[PDB]
Structure 1
């Protein structure tokens, strides 16, 4: 293989070896003839001019290949981009063997972290500086069938070594709640209604800006109702300042965006009493002329009735909806009738971004899809403001940077998305470069994401992408295009990835090293065949009707037991809890003496007694 052409940035070769083409082995290691993913090397005197193969066959004119120049070495220094002299006819082009690849893939910086093994040989590491991965941006694009959860979780877990990253801080905005099993004990879990070991996510609504309050609670008031709400909010803030003294807060500089709690249940009670009750004496609308606040029940007609009866009714309905419990009924931030809570927002911030762990998992799985975009925007803005307004102290985002991952972002970061979350993401991308806040996008349909926002991401994680629209859209956002790496996209095995960006010295199509056994992300989906294979047993829909009327998921009813309660209990893996009823205690006593902990359970207790998961 001797180069016989110089065409700017693509040389062409004419091999003279008759039929070598059989894994030409040098020094006991078998290198191959010019393949798709191989590297080239054209020696010119003393410096080594290297290259990467892009296309093989008649597309270069068979004995012609389409080689692409990338870089060359100086005086035995290192792998450098920018060649000194493109080779000419007469010199034989050699290949980059395993030690030469190690030298090319070797780095002297200890900040570089080995993320896996090259697909070519399973020994050479992918030295990746994690400063670039967190500080600039990230993006994960590929098909769902390529195993995105596995690779993402492996990257997150390797990034979060206690010995290697003692000052890590990772927030994953998983929507499906599929990462609970991924890091069972290494990350906190925040849901709406946790069960055993997860904390309960709570959002104080008074800590958000006025516009977010109008959008989520008021439903988008803009006329007289919005201005009345502004008046009420200002008056309530002044009353809160007067009733309880807040450091740095007085009646002089009470701003609209002041994160000081104000009565909202009492506000609804006032907005209902001003438009419901009837004045005892006509001509006057006195408060003594009546002809609870925490409770949503409200007690000539009153002349102060508003025209926001529908928004008030919507607010009252939201106050009773169980899905708004994490919205308006925070445990430590439960606003009393006089606007008094047991704790403050600093406690919330400390609980969120100050835990003893390195990774914290916040899950919005149970959130209603009605205002989810506003909730995401509120969370992102709260994090950014908390770590920017306190960025001068060593507790800010600068002195301990953060990395927020957003999954399935093509629905919230679309080309025509006009929500509040996209504004916050743009603000982060445009400001946090100095504030040290990272962002990583996860999606399985890259063709919908905005081009410019994706173009602002530093490093990409390319998985298998069969459809060509996704390939075109991804190529539209990468500025270092090598046809050897550009065309290998749709034939990636489930687990491999292409990492391109500032986090790698050379574009590495490496293998995402699988996470250790026992930590494999998987949502707890039902098994169709297992559920549908069991025989038909009698049912009791009266309990279902009672639960539906009561709107309660709690029924009225390790091998534990209670002979008085006659409820044998067997526990499965992953924290599942079962309560088998109508089980005589002798059966469970025999089961405890049966084998060890199984068999007997499926033999008799599985499909003979009503259970409860």
Structure 2
């Protein structure tokens, strides 16, 4: 293989070896003839001019290949981009063997972290500086069938070594709640209604800006109702300042965006009493002429009735909805009738971004899809403001690297998305470069994401992408295009990835090293065949009707037991809890003496007694 052409940025070769083409082995290691993913090397005197193969066959004119120049070495220094002299006819082009690849893939910086093994040989590491991965941006694009959860979780877990990253801080905005099993004990879990070991996510609504309050609670008031709400909010803030003294807060500089709690249940009670009750004496609308607040029940007609009866009714309905419990009924931030809570927002911030762990998992799985975009925007803005307004102290984002991952972002970061979350993401991308806040996008349909926002991401994680629209859209956002790496996209095995960006010295199509056994992300989906294979047993829909009327998921009813309660209990893996009823205690006593902990359970207790998961 001797180069016989120089065409700017693509040389062409004419091999003279008759039929070598059989894994030409040098020094006991078998290198191959010019393949798709191989590297080239054209020696010119003393410096080594290297290259990467892009296309093989008649597309270069068979004995012609389409080689692409990338870089060359100086005086035995290192792998450098920018060649000194493109080779000419007469010199034989050699290949980059395993030690030469190690030298090319070797780095002297200890900040570089080995993320896996090259697909070519399973020994050479992918030295990746994690400063670039957290500080600039990230993006994960590929098909769902390529195993995105596995690779993402492996990257997150390797990034979060206690010995290697003692000052890590990772927030994953998983929507499906599929990462609970991924890091069972290494990350906190925040849901709406946790069960055993997860904390309960709570959002104080008074800590958000006025516009967010109008959008989520008021439903988008803009006329007289919005201005009345502004008046009520200002008056309530002044009353809260007067009733309880807040450091740095007085009646002089009470701003609209002041994160000081104000009565909202009492506000609804006032907005209902001003438009419901009837004045005892006509001509006057006195408060003594009546002809609870925490409770949503409200007690000539009153002349102060508003025209926001529908928004008030919507607010009252939201106050009773169980899905708004984490919205308006925070445990430590439960606003009393006089606007008094047991704790403050600093406690919330400390609980969120100050835990003893390195990774914290916040899950919005149970959130209603009605205002989810506003909730995401509120969370992102709260994090950014908390770590920017306190960025001068060593507790800010600058002294504590923060990396927020957003999954399935093509629905919230679309080309025509006009929500509040996209504004916050743009603000982060445009400001946090100095504030040290990272962002990583996860999606399985890259063709919908905005081009410019994706173009602002530093490093990409390319998985298998069969459809060509996704390939075109991804190529539209990468500025270092090598046809050897550009065309290998749709034939990636489930687990491999292409990492391109500032986090790698050379574009590495490496293998995402699988996470250790026992930590494999998987949502707890039902098994169709297992559920549908069991025989038909009698059912009791009266309990279902009672639960539906009561709107309660709690029924009225390790091998534990209670002979008085006659409820044998067997526990499965992953924290599942079962309560088998109508089980005589002798059966469970025999089961405890049966084998060890199984068999007997499926033999008799599985499909003979009503259970409860």
TM-score range, shorter chain: over 0.9
Are residue 181 (structure 1) and residue 178 (structure 2) matched? no
Structure 2 counterpart SS, 1:316: helix
Distance between the aligned counterparts of 2:297 and 2:237, measured in 1? 25
Distance 2:111 2:31 in 1: 31
Counterpart secondary structure, 2:495? coil
* Structure 1 portions without partners, runs of 5+: none
Q: How far does residue 211 in structure 1 lie from its aligned partner after superposition?
A: 0.0
- 1:301-327 Cα offsets, whole Å, 9 max, x none, are 000000000000000000000000000
Aligned to 1:514: 514
Aligned to 2:554: 554
The DSSP-based 3-state class of the residue aligned with 1:490 is helix
1:380 aligns with 2:377: no
Shift of the alpha carbon at 1:485? 0.0
Give the whole-Å Cα distance in 2 for the aligned partners of 1:594 and 1:252: 75
Deviating 4+ runs (over 4 angstroms): none
C-alpha distance in 2 between matches for 1:400 and 1:203:
23
Describe the superposition over 1:388-419 as per-residue Cα deviations: whole angstroms up to 9, x where unpaired: 00000000000011000000000000000000
How many residues in Structure 1 have an aligned counterpart in Structure 2? 613
Could you list the per-position Cα deviations for residues 32-54 of structure 1 after superposition, in whole angstroms to 9, with x for gaps in the alignment? 00000000000000000000000
SS in 1 for 2:542: helix
Deviations 1:273-319 (A, max 9, x none): 00000000000000000000000000000000000000000000000
Determine the C-alpha separation between the residues in 2 that align with 1:48 and 1:55.
22
C-alpha separation between the residues in 2 aligned to 1:535 and 1:422? Answer: 50
CA deviation after TM superposition for structure 1 residue 574, in Å: 0.0
Shift of 1:499: 0.0
CA displacement at 1:382 relative to structure 2: 0.0
Residues 76-111 of structure 1: CA deviation (Å, up to 9, x unaligned): 000000000000000000000000000000000000
> Cα deviation per residue 1:193-249 (whole Å; 9 max; x = unaligned)?
000000000000000000000000000000000000000000000000000000000
Which SS does the other structure have where 1:85 is aligned? coil
Per-residue CA distance 1:523-545 (angstroms, 9 max, x = gap): 00000000000000000000000
CA distance in 2, matches of 1:401, 1:32: 43
Aligned-residue CA RMSD in angstroms? 0.1
CA distance in 2, matches of 1:9, 1:424: 41
Q: CA deviation at 1:468?
A: 0.0
Q: CA deviation digits over 1:315-363, x for unaligned, max 9?
A: 0000000000000000000000000000000000000000000000000
Q: Could you tell me how far apart the structure 2 residues matched to 1:588 and 1:227 are?
A: 66
Rounded to whole Å, the distance in 2 between the matches of 1:498 and 1:193 is 38
Give the distance between the partners of 1:384 and 1:600, measured in 2 at CA: 55
Which SS does the other structure have where 1:280 is aligned?
coil
Is there any run of 5+ residues in structure 2 with no aligned partner, and where?
none
Describe the superposition over 1:49-85 as per-residue Cα deviations: whole angstroms up to 9, x where unpaired: 0000000000000000000000000000000000000
For residues 422-469 of structure 1, the C-alpha deviation after alignment (integer angstroms, 9 at most, x for no partner) is 000000000000000000000000000000000000000000000000
Please say if 1:572 is aligned against 2:572: yes
Deviations 1:12-33 (CA, angstroms, capped at 9, x unpaired) = 0000000000000000000000
SS in 1 for 2:336: coil
Question: How many angstroms apart in 2 are the aligned matches of 1:401 and 1:229?
Answer: 38
SS at match of 1:310: helix
Distance 1:401 1:356 in 2: 15
Alignment match, 2:505 = 505
Instruction: Name the CA distance, whole Å, in 1 between partners of 2:37 and 2:575.
Output: 45
Tell me, yes or no, if structure 1 residue 482 matches structure 2 residue 473. no
**SS of the residue 2:88 aligns to:** coil
1:535-585 deviation digits (Å, cap 9, x = unpaired): 000000000000000000000000000000000000000000000000000
TM-score by length of 2: 1.00
The corresponding residue for 1:58 is 58
1:375 CA displacement: 0.0
Q: Secondary structure at the match of 2:432?
A: helix
Shift of 1:492: 0.0
Secondary structure, aligned partner of 2:327: helix
Alpha-carbon distance between aligned partners in 1 of 2:88 and 2:501, rounded to the nearest angstrom: 31
1:139, distance to aligned residue in structure 2 (A): 0.0
Q: TM-score under structure 1 normalisation?
A: 1.00
Q: What secondary structure, in the 3-state scheme, does the structure 1 residue paired with 2:404 have?
A: strand
SS at match of 1:32: coil
- Give the Cα separation in 2 of the matches to 1:339 and 1:34: 74
- The whole-number CA distance in structure 1 between the counterparts of 2:459 and 2:116 is 16
The CA deviation at 1:510 is 0.0
